[PDB]
Each structure stands twice: as C-alpha cells, then as structure tokens.
Amino acid sequence: ASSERELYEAWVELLSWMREYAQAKGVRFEKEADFPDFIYRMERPYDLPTTIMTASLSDGLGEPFLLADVSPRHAKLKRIGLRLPRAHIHLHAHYEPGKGLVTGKIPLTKERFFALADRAREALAFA
Amino acid sequence: MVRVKVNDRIVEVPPGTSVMDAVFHAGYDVPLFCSEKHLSPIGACRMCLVRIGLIQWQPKLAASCVTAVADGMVVDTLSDVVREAQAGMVEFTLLNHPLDCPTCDKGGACELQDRTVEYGLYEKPLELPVYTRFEFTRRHVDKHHPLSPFVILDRERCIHCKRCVRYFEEVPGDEVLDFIERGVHTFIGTMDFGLPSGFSGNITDICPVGALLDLTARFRARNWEMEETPTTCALCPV
Amino acid sequence: MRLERVLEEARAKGYPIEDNGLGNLWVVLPRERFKEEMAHYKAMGFNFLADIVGLDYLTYPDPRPERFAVVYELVSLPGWKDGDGSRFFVRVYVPEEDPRLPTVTDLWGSANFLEREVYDLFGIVFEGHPDLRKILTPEDLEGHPLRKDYPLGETPTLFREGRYIIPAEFRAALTGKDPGLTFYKGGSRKGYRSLW
Amino acid sequence: TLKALAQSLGITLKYLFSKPVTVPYPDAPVALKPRFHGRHVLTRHPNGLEKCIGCSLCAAACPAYAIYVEPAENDPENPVSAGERYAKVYEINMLRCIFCGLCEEACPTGAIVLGYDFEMADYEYSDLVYGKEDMLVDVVGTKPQRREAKRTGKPVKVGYVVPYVRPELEGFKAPTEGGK
Amino acid sequence: REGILFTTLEKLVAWGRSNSLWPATFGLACCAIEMMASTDARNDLARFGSEVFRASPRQADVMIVAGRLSKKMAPVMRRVWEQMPDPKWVISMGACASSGGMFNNYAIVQNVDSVVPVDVYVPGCPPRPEALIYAVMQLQKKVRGQAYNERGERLPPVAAWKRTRG
Amino acid sequence: MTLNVGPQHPSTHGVLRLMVTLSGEEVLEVVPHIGYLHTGFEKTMEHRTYLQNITYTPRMDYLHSFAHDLAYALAVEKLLGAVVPPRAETIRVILNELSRLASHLVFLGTGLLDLGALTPFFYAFRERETILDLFEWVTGQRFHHNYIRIGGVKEDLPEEFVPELKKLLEVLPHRIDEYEALFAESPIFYERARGVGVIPPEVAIDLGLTGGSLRASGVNYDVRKAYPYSGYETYTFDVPLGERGDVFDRMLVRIREMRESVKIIKQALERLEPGPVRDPNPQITPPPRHLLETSMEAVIYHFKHYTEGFHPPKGEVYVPTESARGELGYYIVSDGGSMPYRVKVRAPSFVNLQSLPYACKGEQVPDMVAIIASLDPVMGDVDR
Numbered sequence A: 001a002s003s004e005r006e007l008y009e010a011w012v013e014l015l016s017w018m019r020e021y022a023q024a025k026g027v028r029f030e031k032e033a034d035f036p037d038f039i040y041r042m043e044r045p046y047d048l049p050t051t052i053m054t055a056s057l058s059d060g061l062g063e064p065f066l067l068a069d070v071s072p073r074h075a076k077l078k079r080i081g082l083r084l085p086r087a088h089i090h091l092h093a094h095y096e097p098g099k100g101l102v103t104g105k106i107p108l109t110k111e112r113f114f115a116l117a118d119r120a121r122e123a124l125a126f127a
Numbered sequence B: 001m002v003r004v005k006v007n008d009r010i011v012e013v014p015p016g017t018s019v020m021d022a023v024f025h026a027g028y029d030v031p032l033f034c035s036e037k038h039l040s041p042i043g044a045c046r047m048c049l050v051r052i053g054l055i056q057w058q059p060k061l062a063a064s065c066v067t068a069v070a071d072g073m074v075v076d077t078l079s080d081v082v083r084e085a086q087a088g089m090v091e092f093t094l095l096n097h098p099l100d101c102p103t104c105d106k107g108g109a110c111e112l113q114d115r116t117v118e119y120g121l122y123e124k125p126l127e128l129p130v131y132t133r134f135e136f137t138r139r140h141v142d143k144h145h146p147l148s149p150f151v152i153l154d155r156e157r158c159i160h161c162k163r164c165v166r167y168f169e170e171v172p173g174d175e176v177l178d179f180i181e182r183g184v185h186t187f188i189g190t191m192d193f194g195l196p197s198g199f200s201g202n203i204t205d206i207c208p209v210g211a212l213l214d215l216t217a218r219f220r221a222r223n224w225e226m227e228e229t230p231t232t233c234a235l236c237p238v
Numbered sequence C: 001m002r003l004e005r006v007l008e009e010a011r012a013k014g015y016p017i018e019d020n021g022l023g024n025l026w027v028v029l030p031r032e033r034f035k036e037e038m039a040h041y042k043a044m045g046f047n048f049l050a051d052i053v054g055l056d057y058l059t060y061p062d063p064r065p066e067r068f069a070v071v072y073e074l075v076s077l078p079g080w081k082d083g084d085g086s087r088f089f090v091r092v093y094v095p096e097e098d099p100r101l102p103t104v105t106d107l108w109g110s111a112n113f114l115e116r117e118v119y120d121l122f123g124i125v126f127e128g129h130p131d132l133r134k135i136l137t138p139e140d141l142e143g144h145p146l147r148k149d150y151p152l153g154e155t156p157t158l159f160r161e162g163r164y165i166i167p168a169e170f171r172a173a174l175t176g177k178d179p180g181l182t183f184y185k186g187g188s189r190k191g192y193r194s195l196w
Numbered sequence D: 001t002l003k004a005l006a007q008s009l010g011i012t013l014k015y016l017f018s019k020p021v022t023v024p025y026p027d028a029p030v031a032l033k034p035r036f037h038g039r040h041v042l043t044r045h046p047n048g049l050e051k052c053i054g055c056s057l058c059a060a061a062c063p064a065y066a067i068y069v070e071p072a073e074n075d076p077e078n079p080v081s082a083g084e085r086y087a088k089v090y091e092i093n094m095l096r097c098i099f100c101g102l103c104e105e106a107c108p109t110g111a112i113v114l115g116y117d118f119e120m121a122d123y124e125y126s127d128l129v130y131g132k133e134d135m136l137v138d139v140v141g142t143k144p145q146r147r148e149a150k151r152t153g154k155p156v157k158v159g160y161v162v163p164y165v166r167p168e169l170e171g172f173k174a175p176t177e178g179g180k
Numbered sequence E: 001r002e003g004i005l006f007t008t009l010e011k012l013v014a015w016g017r018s019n020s021l022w023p024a025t026f027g028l029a030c031c032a033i034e035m036m037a038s039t040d041a042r043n044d045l046a047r048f049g050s051e052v053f054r055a056s057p058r059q060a061d062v063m064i065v066a067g068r069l070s071k072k073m074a075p076v077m078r079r080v081w082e083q084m085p086d087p088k089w090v091i092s093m094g095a096c097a098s099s100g101g102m103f104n105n106y107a108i109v110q111n112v113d114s115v116v117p118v119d120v121y122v123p124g125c126p127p128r129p130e131a132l133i134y135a136v137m138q139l140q141k142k143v144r145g146q147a148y149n150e151r152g153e154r155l156p157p158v159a160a161w162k163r164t165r166g
Numbered sequence F: 001m002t003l004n005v006g007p008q009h010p011s012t013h014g015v016l017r018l019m020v021t022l023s024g025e026e027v028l029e030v031v032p033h034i035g036y037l038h039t040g041f042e043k044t045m046e047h048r049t050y051l052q053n054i055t056y057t058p059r060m061d062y063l064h065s066f067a068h069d070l071a072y073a074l075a076v077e078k079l080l081g082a083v084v085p086p087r088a089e090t091i092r093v094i095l096n097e098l099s100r101l102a103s104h105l106v107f108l109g110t111g112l113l114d115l116g117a118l119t120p121f122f123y124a125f126r127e128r129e130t131i132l133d134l135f136e137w138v139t140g141q142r143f144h145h146n147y148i149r150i151g152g153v154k155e156d157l158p159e160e161f162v163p164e165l166k167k168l169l170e171v172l173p174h175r176i177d178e179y180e181a182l183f184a185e186s187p188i189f190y191e192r193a194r195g196v197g198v199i200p201p202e203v204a205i206d207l208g209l210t211g212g213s214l215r216a217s218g219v220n221y222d223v224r225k226a227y228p229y230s231g232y233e234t235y236t237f238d239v240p241l242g243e244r245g246d247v248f249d250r251m252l253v254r255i256r257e258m259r260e261s262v263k264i265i266k267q268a269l270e271r272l273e274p275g276p277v278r279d280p281n282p283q284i285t286p287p288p289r290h291l292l293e294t295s296m297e298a299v300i301y302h303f304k305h306y307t308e309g310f311h312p313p314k315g316e317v318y319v320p321t322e323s324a325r326g327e328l329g330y331y332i333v334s335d336g337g338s339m340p341y342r343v344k345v346r347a348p349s350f351v352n353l354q355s356l357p358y359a360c361k362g363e364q365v366p367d368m369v370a371i372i373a374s375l376d377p378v379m380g381d382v383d384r
C-alpha cells in the first residue's frame, strides 16, 4: 500500500549505496532507465523521490556486474531486484513492515550489499 | 508439382517446399518472426502455426513453414482460432518487451510492431477496450552496452531473435555469440568482446528489433524520414 | 424501385453489376450502348443526373479492364412529384487510346460543364459537347493534369541554415502497391472492415 | 411598404443610444477560451527538465512539414532532458505552421502546447522561422514584442485573458482576468 | 518631392502618411470573411485612418494580399499593384498567402512575395483580426522608421523600393 | 457589347471574369469565365493520409466548414464500418446546425452588403461573433475544426458551453425577426427582387441546382429527409420552402431555416448526457493518451496510428448529404493504402453555377449583380 513509499525510500537508499561503492572503488556506474511513467507523465501527478527506474554498476567496459531495478509505481508485485550477470543470482528485495527492508527475510544492510558487490566485482571481473 | 489449396485458391508449387511460401504466393499471409530469407527455419517463433486438412484437421498447429507440403492439401489461415492465437502469442511476446518506442529506432522497421497491430486485438464489437492482462513489473536487464566500434547493444530489445546467432552459423560459419542463462533468465552475449569477423554488420539489418544499431546514426534521424536510395556498391569488385 | 425495371433489364443484357455492402451499385457497360441505355432511363423516369466522376486507374494493385473509367450517378428525386429515391451508379470502362465518349448533355444540361472538367482533369473528349476549354485550370499547363502519371509538384520547405525537407520522401505514407519498410504485410495493414 | 421604413429607424435609434458592445484592442484584453491555439510552447518538468525528447511524432503529423528537428542523445551526467534523446535543434517555420494541435496529440512528452500568442508579424521571411528558445514556456513575449521591448526598454503585455489556464499548460502563467 | 528633407517635414508628413492607412483588401480566400469581421463589430479601423476598405487602388495604397492564390492570379495581382499610386505598402496577410500553408502543388503559388515585394508578413491562417492590428501597428511604426529587423537592421520606410515602383 | 467584369470586384469576390453580352442597356447572356483559382485538393489528398485529409475539408468552405468535414468523416466511417456514440452524434448535429446558422448569417450579411442598405450586416455579424465565440470555446479555433474525429469527436464539451448556448438561443428569435423585418416590407425590396431570379423547377434539375435553390423554388428536397442520415431521422423539423425561383423567395427561406435549426438545437440539448466521445475500438481509433503510461500495446498502436495511419479495406464509397450549400458528398476510392486512390468531391455550388447564363437570361444590367449574389458563390466549390 504505502509500503510503496518506504520501498521507494529504500530504493533511493540502495541506489545511494551503489553510487558510494561506485566512487569508493572508482568503479563505473551508469544509470540505465527512467520511469515510463515520468516520460508519459505530463500533468498527471508525479511525486516519486527520484526519476530513476534502473541503474547499474559496470566493470568499466559498459558491461554490468550488477543490475539494480525498482518496480514502477502502479506496476504490481512491487519489489526491487538485483541480479548478477552470469551468475544466475536473482535477489528479490521485499519490504517487511515492523522490520525494514529484507533480502528474502534477512534484513539488508549496506555491508551485505558491499559483500555481494565485492564478490561480484572481483569474481566476475569480466574486463 | 504439389497440389496445394490455401483456403480458397489452389497453386502448383513443386515438392519439398514449405507451406508458408505457397501461402504467400497465394496471397495469404501470417505473422512470421523466426525463419527468414536465405536461412533454414526453426520452429522458434511459432507464428506460422496453422491448421491443415488433407480432409481432417491436425490436433496441434504445426508451423506450416517448417512442415513440407502435400498434394490435395487444404490450409486454413483465415481461422478465427488462428487470429485469436496470433494475438495470444503476440501478448506473450510483449510481456517483457520494454516500452521504448519513441526512442526505439527499430521504429518504422519494427516489423514486430507492425505484426502486433496487424494480427493483434482482443477477443471481444467492443464497447470498452482491453489492453492487457499483464500488469506486473517487467524484467530489467542490460542496456547501453557498446558492442563494437560501430554497434551499440541494449539487450532488453531482443526478442530472442536467434537470427544473428543462427547467421553466424549459417552464413560465415564463424560464431562469436551465444545464449547464456537458461529459461527466462537467458540472454545472448559475446565473449569475444568485439567481434573480429569480417562480416558482422549485416546483423543490424537482421535484428528484428533495434538491439543492434549503428551507433554512428543513433539519435540522428528517424526510420521513415530517410530516403532509401537503391544504388550500387563499388567498394569491392563485387 | 424505378431502378428495378432497369435492373432486370441490365441482367437481361448481362451487364455486370457491382455492389458494395454499403449498398452502392455500379453497372458496367460498354461505351457504344451507353447513350441509348441512358436515354431509356431518363425516359423511365430518372430525374436527376448528379455526377460524372472520371477515374484514372493508371496504377492499381488489381487488374481493371481499362485505365480510364467514367461513372455517372443517376438519381430519382422522390421529393419531386416523380421519383423514388432510386440512386445508382453506372460505370463504363474507357479505352485509353480513344478518350472519346458521347455526351449526356442531351439528357441533362448539368453535364455540360461536368464533362468539361473531365476533359481537363483526365483526357476525355466527350463527343457532342459544345466548348472544350479549361474552366478551372490554366491553359498554360498542359497534359490533362490530375492524373497519376501527371507530376505532383513539390518544393522543399526551408529552415535555418538552409536546412530543408523534401516532402515526397518525407512521408511514411503509402499505397497498397507500395510496400514500405516491411517486406510484406497482411492483417490490418492489408485493410480491415467490420460487420459487428 | 412604408411602415417598415419607420420601424427600421426605430430599432437602430435604440441602438444608437445603446452604449456599444465592441471591445477596444489592445486596451481591454481579448477574450479567449482555454482551448485556444496560439504559438507552441515547449514545456519542462519541475525538475527543470525539458519534457521533449525530440519525439518528432509531430513531424509525421505536420502536413506542412513545419518542423526541422535535429535530434541528439542527452549528456549522461548533465542530461538536458531526463531522456536519452532530446531535440538538439528544434525549429518551427511559423510561415506555414499548421499548429496542427494533432501535433500536441502525437507528442508524448506533451512538449508542444499551443500558446495564446498571435502577436507575431515581421517584415522578414527568415525571422519568422521561430527557434527553440523562442518556443519555450520561458519566454516573455513574441519575438518582435521582445525585440521591441529591449530596444525601447519598455516591459511587456500581451493583451489577452482566458478564464483560467488550460490544464495542459502548467508552467507559464498568462494574464487571466487579473492580467492583460 | 514627397515631404522630407527638413526635420519638420519628414516627421509631419510621415505622421500624416502613417496615420491615414487606407486598406485595399485582396480577398480570394477565407481571409475576406474574417476581414469584414476585422473591420467592424468588435473593433474598428476608422481610428486608423480607414473608411477605405474597398476595391479601388484609386482610394488606397495599402495592399493587403489576403489569401492562398494560383498561377492565374499572379499577373493580375501584379497589375493591380501597378495601378496604385507611387508610395504603396505590401502586407502579406496570412499563412495561406505568405508561404503557401499546406499545399505544395503546381496549381498554387507558394510564397506570394514572388509576385510582388512585401514589407509585412502576418502569418496564421486564420489569424486573429487583432494580429492584423498588431501588424499594422508594426507597419505604422515601420514606415515611421522606428523599426528594424530581428538583427537590429534598419530598412526603408516603404515596401516600394525592393523591386521597381510604378 | 461584351463587357468584362474581372475578379475581386467590387466586394463580390468571386474570381469572376464575366463576358456579358449586352444590348448596351440589357444583359442578354453571360458566358462566365472562371477557374482562376484552383488547387486540386482531390489530387493532393491522395498524397496525404486520411487523418490529414481532415485538414483539407474545411479549407474549401468558408461557410459551413463542419459539413464538408462531416461528409468526409461519414464516408470513411461507413467504409470501415465504424460507429459513433450517441452523444457524439448529438454534438455533431449541434455543431452542424450551428454552422448552418453561421452560413446563413454570412449569406444575408453579404446579401445586404452586395447591394442594398449596408448596415444590418454588422448586426448579423454581432451574432456571428457570438457563434464564433461558441466555436472558439469548444474547439479553440474560430473556425476550421478537427473536433470531430473518427469514431466521434475527440474530447468532451466544455461545461461553459451550456450557459452560453442557452443564452444565444434566447436572444436569436427576436433578432432573426428583426432582420426579416427589413425585407418583406420595404416596397423597394420588392422592386429590386421579386421579378428576378427566374428559372423553372424543371430546368433547375436539368442544369442542376441544389436545395435552397431547388427548395428556393419550393421543391421539397431535403437530403436529410430523403436519405436521412444520422440523428435527423429522429428529429422533427420540417422543410422550409419557397415556391418560385427568385431572389425574393430564397431570402425568406433562409430565415425560416434558422428557426428550424434552433428548434433542433433545442431538441438536441434535451438529448444530451455523458458518454464516450469516440469509438472505443482502439484498432481503428487512436487510443487515449492517459494510458501510454500504462501498456505497451497502447504505445504501439498509438505510435503507429499517428505515424502510418491505418489501412481501410479496398472500396469506393459515397454518401449523399445535405449541406448548407446543397447536395454534398464524397466519392472516395481507396485502394487500401494509407492514402486514398481517388478523392472525388461533389461540389454543389459549382454545379449550381452552371445554371447562371440561364438564370441571367435577358436581365437588366444593375440587376445582374444581385442575381449572382443571390445564388451564393463559395468559390471553393468551383475552384477546388
């Protein structure tokens, strides 16, 4: 319901992290997508806390090692997903009220995400 | 030659031939996505599924194109059930096809697009339209990946055109691509990272979506606007 | 209904009878027999000769017997003290080689000018017509203009730094003959209609 | 006959003393309705980001072909519009603009939104092919109006009012019964 | 010999000329019907030196080329133009005239300015009457010489020395 | 002598070059010479889309614009068999009749202007402005309109439309009368009009005249009755008629029409309620734009519609209609392209003009001006 909001707020959060890691390691970031519902929004209420629907971390070859996508506004089954290229690792962030934002059921933290990132970055290291 | 009747018209057309071609000769038509000129079919698009009588009717709609012909055959294409199904498959196709039309530069050449509008439309005279049954979030995957000094790749364009991968086998017999993950997780990639084949660029044309485009003319003009000037090459003695 | 005594006759004389499901009807005649046939109709109580549309079938994506075809629309004004509302077309395919045809000035003075237009726009000389002149176009431009063959006359539109558009390839538009970018078409893009 | 002649005069005489109904221009603003079609404005988001992407849908719609549009792909770091494509050149030849409105209907960014302008007229052909920056939601007048207002140093007015904005426009505030 | 070449005269006479504008409309289009509108019935023109609104160049020198035209009209218009007195102004009214709107065709004449020189364009088909007012206000101050172009560039106080006058 | 009355004169503004064979005090015959304007719309429109063609339709009728438009609309609609919502159809008649009134306003406005006393024009124009204000409201356009769209108009009415519409229906009856008041008495009116404008009903058909010329000679011939098309079937109203071909008769007819038109308005308002405004088959109709946001299939069809535009099937089509100016209709051959393979326009006024040397037999020289004017020339019919 309003789950939505905290999720969005979480999505920003996560994104923020993605940038941080990006700068931290100096690794390449690229915003991928923006909301359809921003484009074709044109007088109908927009209030999303960012404009960004999809964004990714790339190796420095334009090849991502990590993709990060939010669900759109009215697009049901609202979750945020991650997936590591060539790994078949598909992560489904739910939000759980009374907890926070959970990875399956385990609460996400930044470090979790960093660990995922480093193992990605270093392992797959396509370039 | 083989005695074919597609619906209301009969044609001779020698044997070993695809139903499909006789269909088009007959001035009857179907949506088509997998198989292509100068290339061995596969069943993959499954768009050429018809029913046939020879006189009974198959219990499973065979890809006409893939099947050979038969004398005394009836081919049914104006089938109500076909049309419904066409739409069906269309919808299925559209499930993750990312919305990008205005900036899609497959565009006027989005044959896919044209089939959609040709053969699609909900089963219901309407008093209210329908558009979907889908509503869940789409897949989000790979884009803005330069594939080559000439070719940009934004992956979620692909319909799983298998055409290019196929091309590489059929035509040069030199391969550089492959499907990667399985099922829905799948997607085509290279591991050449820049394809050192002397023939490559034709895939742009082959790509029945806008995944492989000429970056050099990316965001420079629109499909319809161009004058497509048939003329002659001289850059090789061919 | 006035129509019907024409219809049985038409059938009797074996003339092909076109019909659109929109309830519009043509009668395909030869040139020769037209005049008299049409004479008989006015006599049979055909009030009003509404139209003469000259047709150029230079390029068509189906075969037709002739390139030039005329079409009359005859009507019976029921609001008049005679008439039944009996409205129907007569089509008459026309040799390109002879752009002749006897007038129907003879049965309506409306015709006069109508046929004049048709000389201008398509090449047809209607036999037995006083005055051919353009009544609608220059006589300094020749070639019986408004034909498919006839030029379309475009000019590039101009924008800053001389940047221009050429209309005739700008268009994403098409004809049925035309294929566009697509290698084929079917479905909707081969037309569509409804019944529901 | 004769009676009438008198009656004729009668009514007109009523009207003579009637205080008239005409509106002076540009001394009381012209009355327009919100659906009115003036000079196209190019809109933007509150994100300060131009809506248009060089959609160029309009261009198929324009029967006059009144649009010269050079496209471009936005800066990734500094995108002039959030999109990945924008209109690197946006020209409109007003000398033949159809102001299709169908234009608006095709544009999906809703970039193009007819204005309330009509105060356009100049002496030179090529000045009347209005540019991008003249076609915004950020200008303060018509090209000649503005060009006058600098050399003269005078401010602006446009002499129209609507009952209220059209919802479609949502940037620029026009004089609306409360301006001129 | 036309009222110039002393400080006094030129401003005087120019005020005279500017304020007395006598429109001769050259309808052949929808423009006309809006033009009769443009005359009366909401707004006036008599306060801009116009009782002349009608067909004699023997009454006017303000040429309003109002409407989309054909080949057949070019020499005609030319000649009509010629049968005006020596100072004379050319309004090119509306899109239909000015550059041929939405027609690209042999029949038509595109870019009316071909046939005769122009000093004022006023686009829009239809335009608003009021735009025409704005235009003649332009044309007023234009012949007054208190005008430029959009590049600051000055210009003569007449339409009639861009091609030959007579 | 053969007198040469050239174009643009005096304020009659037909391109008219007229060879008047005179007796030096009478008209014998006029050989009209015309066609000094022309475009060849019919050509051009085969080089534009169907949607595009709707641009062209009001651009050849200064008067009742919407009728051309409608007639063309109908033809298309028939062809692919599309239907129109009832409310849509309501709106369509309203605009149509509003446009008829407009036409009449202009007809009589010009009538006065052309010759006779000049002034009342301006009053008729006041009303015209009112009408224009109504058009402005709903279509944002003074005239020329595109509000009508395929499947029905393209958006809902203003609420603001309702007050003003009532308002003007209040004023008009009285106003109409007062214009009429100028004519029927004024024994000079008689002496200018009655005798002239002669032509037998029989010859009206032979040379082709259309209603309000034909019905100006009181011959009942409403194409809205005879080939009744939408809504009018179920609307009462009668035919206004004269009973002889003269100027005199014409003039009075028109006044009566207006009153009929007003009752039709009145009827219409009753029959007006919410509803979709165009056909909801998105195959054939462009979709709502509040849904691009939503589905791909929307986006696809939308994109497609406004680019390529549909393919109607192969066919010829014609519908007869009653315009303000007479028998209107489009004979449209489509080959199933994105543009038609033939656009024939039935232009009534043009056919009505054929009857001019006839109409103007043996007439008197100051009278001949009026006799042209009385027939109503819109040059678009003629010139095309």
Ligand code: SF4
Residues within 6 Å of the ligand: B098, B099, B100, B101, B102, B103, B104, B105, B106, B107, B108, B110, B112, B113, B157, B208, B209, B210, B211
């Ligand atoms: S591939 Fe085709 S359907 Fe997809 S965005 Fe591009 S043009 Fe549109």
Ligand code: SF4
Residues within 6 Å of the ligand: B157, B158, B159, B160, B161, B162, B163, B164, B165, B206, B207, B208, B209, B211, B212
């Ligand atoms: S990239 Fe294109 S051609 Fe290749 S499989 Fe995908 S859809 Fe087919």
Ligand code: SF4
Residues within 6 Å of the ligand: D051, D052, D053, D054, D055, D056, D057, D058, D087, D106, D107, D108, D109, D110, D111, D112
């Ligand atoms: S104004 Fe709209 S339609 Fe035109 S290019 Fe911009 S986004 Fe596209």
Ligand code: SF4
Residues within 6 Å of the ligand: E029, E030, E031, E066, E067, E068, E094, E095, E096, E097, E101, E124, E125, E126, E127, F059
């Ligand atoms: S610009 Fe418009 S109003 Fe003027 S003549 Fe042309 S079509 Fe008519």
Ligand code: FES
Residues within 6 Å of the ligand: B032, B033, B034, B035, B036, B041, B042, B043, B044, B045, B046, B047, B048, B063, B064, B065, B066
């Ligand atoms: S063409 Fe695709 S299954 Fe045959």
